[PDB]
Each structure stands twice: as structure tokens, then as C-alpha cells.
């Protein structure tokens, strides 16, 4: 399921912005 | 609502042409908790020793700004973040520098962030999640009038207050720009197909961002996930979202227009502006202005254990707050 895959992701916890 | 925004831009005007500065002294207030960290800097749960207030101070290291090229977008967040007032954003009460560092105190909202709620408890009802998205709306259309692009919408960055409502926080990529701007700034998961093909863009990544965050807020995952940057990117600009069954008839519509990457089509972005939102259906039981007053009774509270509480937030490495007797970046940060 997708909930799966996404808690098994590395990127459930605090993300962290962008830049250069 | 186009009165109050009239008046609106006459006061944030005034205040943006002459921003206050150096209203206060880190001595003024006792350091009790790291309630969150970033790159170049920490949130503080502090105490205003004359008046016995809890604050939340971001404490940026003026070096650590440099390094990562953020001199100009810090002097954006204060010199916005000082100029405006709305409900739902985190009120800057006293800013100042010290040698070392740049201080931003605002108003310190026990709720914690919304991205701990939302992961703990997996997903939000679309009743819970709208109750959030229609202050996001409101609060980009004060936002908006003033000519500020936000930037930064996420979770992480949306605090919640004693009573349930929204604080938007971080203004950091917060830009007073009258027509494009270029700079490549946000959260991967959050960014417009614009942002990331470098073609310049307006107010209306904004509006698609809060297409990430109803999806995320109502699924307990975003639309565009992947374990590296590059490939949230590539399914970003794929032009293809898949909603969960659960999602409603109308909330799939919503994000559609929402999510949508023809800036022509995408809500919040056409003649009608903010009322192609508004008055879409999902919304539909939105009382807005009684959710702009705060009269709308919250779907979830925090839990009262007292002032200064932090049981909201998580724990961090406490660390020293370190004054050099040197001052750093004099000339950078002499506006702030
Ligand atoms: N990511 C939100 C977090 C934060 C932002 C920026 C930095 Cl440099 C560190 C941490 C944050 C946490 C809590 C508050 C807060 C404001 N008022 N009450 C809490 C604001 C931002």
C-alpha cells in the first residue's frame, strides 16, 4: 500500500528545505 | 474582504518602509528549551523576564547565514515577519543581534508542529484538514495582497496554538516581489513544476503547495514521495497524482486545480483568484470570516499542562547560545 511505502521511506521524518 | 485588505496593505506598508530594530537584549530573556533546529540556527522556548511571557526565539548564527547564502533572505523574513499581522501568523514581538547572532522573538504557539500531529496520528479527517487549509487560504490572501510570496509551506512550518488554529512560522524564502522571481527555495515534496524547471515564477507556487499540504494533511502522505529529491522532482513534473480511495469526490477536484501544472488552469492563479478556492465546494461549510475570527470550534485542541509547556515538541541537544567578543558579518546583517 502506499502508506507502507511511504512510512518505510526515508523522508517521514522532518524535511528539510532546499536551495543551491 | 477587499476593504480590509486596503487597509491591510496601509499598515504593512508603513512598517515595511520603516522596520523596527533592536527592540530588545538576549539578557532580557531566560533560554528554556530547543524547540526545533535548522540549518544555520534554533528555535527557543524563552521567557520575557519583565512580563513573565513565554516567546519562541529563533536564534540564527549570523556565520552560519553567510555560509549558506542566506544574508538577503533573512533580512526578507525580518523586515516581513515585523510588518505584518494576521491571526494566523506567528506575531514577531522584538527582534535584535548580537555579535554573533541574529534573534527573532515571536509568539509561542504550546500546540506544537503540525507535522507531529499529522505523523502520529496518520491522517486527518477532510472536515480536520479543511479546518487547517481554510486559514492556509485566508492567510495567502493576506499574504498575497502585500505582494509576499510565502515559499515555504509545509507541516513542519504550520505551528498549533492553545486553541487548536494555525501559526504559520518560518518566512525565511518570504519575498515582497511584484511580478517573478527565480530563486530555487522550499521543501522538495512542496516545490511547483515551475520551481523546479527554473522558469521563473509568482504567488502561484503557493497555491500549489497547498495542494501538497490538503493531500498530505487528508492522505498522511504527499502526492509526490520518493527517497531522494530527483525522483519527487520527476514525479512532480510527471503531471500525474493518484488519490487515495478514500478521498472525496470534491477533494479530488480541489487538488486537481490545485495540483494542476498549467498556471493558466491552476486555482489561485485565474481572473477570480483566491475565490476559485473560496467558493469551491469542498469549502462549501467553510464559514470563513468565523474562522478568521477564531469562532469555529477546533476539531483538535493540545493538551493544557500549563504555560511554557513543551510535551508538544520534541526533544533536541540543548547547546550553548555562544556571544563572540568579536562582532561577525557587521556589514551583512546592518539593517536587521
Ligand atoms: N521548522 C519549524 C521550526 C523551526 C524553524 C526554523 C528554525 Cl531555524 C528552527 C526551527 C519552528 C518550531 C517552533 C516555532 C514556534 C514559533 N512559536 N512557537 C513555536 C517556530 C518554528
Known amino acids: 500500500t502506499t502508506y507502507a511505502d511511504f512510512i518505510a521511506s526515508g523522508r517521514t521524518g522532518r524535511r528539510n528545505a532546499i536551495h543551491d | ?93 522584538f527582534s535584535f543581534k548580537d555579535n554573533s547572532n541574529l534573534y527573532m522573538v515571536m509568539e509561542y504557539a504550546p500546540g506544537g508542529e503540525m507535522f507531529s500531529h499529522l505523523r502520529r496520528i496518520g491522517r486527518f479527517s477532510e472536515p480536520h484538514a479543511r479546518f487547517y487549509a481554510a486559514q492556509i487560504v485566508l492567510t495567502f490572501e493576506y499574504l498575497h495582497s502585500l505582494d509576499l510570496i510565502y515559499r515555504d509551506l509545509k507541516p513542519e512550518n504550520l505551528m498549533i496554538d492553545q486553541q487548536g488554529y494555525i501559526k504559520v512560522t518560518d518566512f525565511g524564502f518570504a519575498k515582497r516581489v511584484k511580478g517573478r522571481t527565480w530563486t530555487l527555495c522550499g521543501t522538495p515534496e512542496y516545490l511547483a513544476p515551475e520551481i523546479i524547471l527554473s522558469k521563473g515564477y509568482n504567488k502561484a507556487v503557493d497555491w500549489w503547495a497547498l495542494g501538497v499540504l490538503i493531500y498530505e494533511m487528508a492522505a498522511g502522505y504527499p502526492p509526490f514521495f520518493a527517497d531522494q529529491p530527483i525522483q519527487i522532482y520527476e514525479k512532480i513534473v510527471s503531471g500525474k497524482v493518484r488519490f487515495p480511495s478514500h478521498f472525496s469526490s470534491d477533494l479530488k477536484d480541489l487538488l486537481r486545480n490545485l495540483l494542476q501544472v498549467d498556471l493558466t488552469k491552476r486555482f489561485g492563479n485565474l481572473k477570480n483568484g483566491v475565490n476559485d478556492i473560496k467558493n469551491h465546494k469542498w469549502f462549501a461549510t467553510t464559514d470563513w470570516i468565523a474562522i478568521y475570527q477564531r469562532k469555529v470550534e477546533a476539531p483538535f485542541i493540545p493538551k493544557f499542562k500549563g504555560p511554557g509547556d513543551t510535551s508538544n515538541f520534541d526533544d533536541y541537544e540543548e547547546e550553548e547560545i555562544r556571544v563572540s567578543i568579536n562582532e561577525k558579518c557587521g556589514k551583512e546583517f546592518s539593517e536587521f
Do not use: C
Not at chain 2, 499598515?11 to 524547540?35: C, G, S, V, Y
Not at chain 2, 534554533?42 to 512580563?51: C, D, G, S, Y
Not at chain 2, 523586515?79 to 514581538?93: C, D, G, H, M, S
Open chain 2, 1 to 93: 474582504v477587499k476593504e480590509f485588505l486596503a487597509k491591510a496593505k496601509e499598515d504593512f506598508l508603513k512598517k515595511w518602509e520603516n522596520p523596527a530594530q533592536n527592540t530588545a537584549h538576549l539578557d532580557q530573556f531566560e533560554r528554556i528549551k530547543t524547540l526545533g533546529t535548522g540549518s544555520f540556527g534554533r528555535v527557543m522556548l524563552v521567557k520575557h523576564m519583565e512580563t513573565g511571557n513565554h516567546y519562541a526565539m529563533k536564534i540564527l548564527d549570523k556565520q552560519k547565514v553567510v555560509k549558506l547564502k542566506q544574508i538577503e533572505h533573512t533580512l526578507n523574513e525580518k523586515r516581513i515577519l515585523q510588518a505584518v499581522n494576521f491571526p494566523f501568523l506567528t506575531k514577531l514581538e
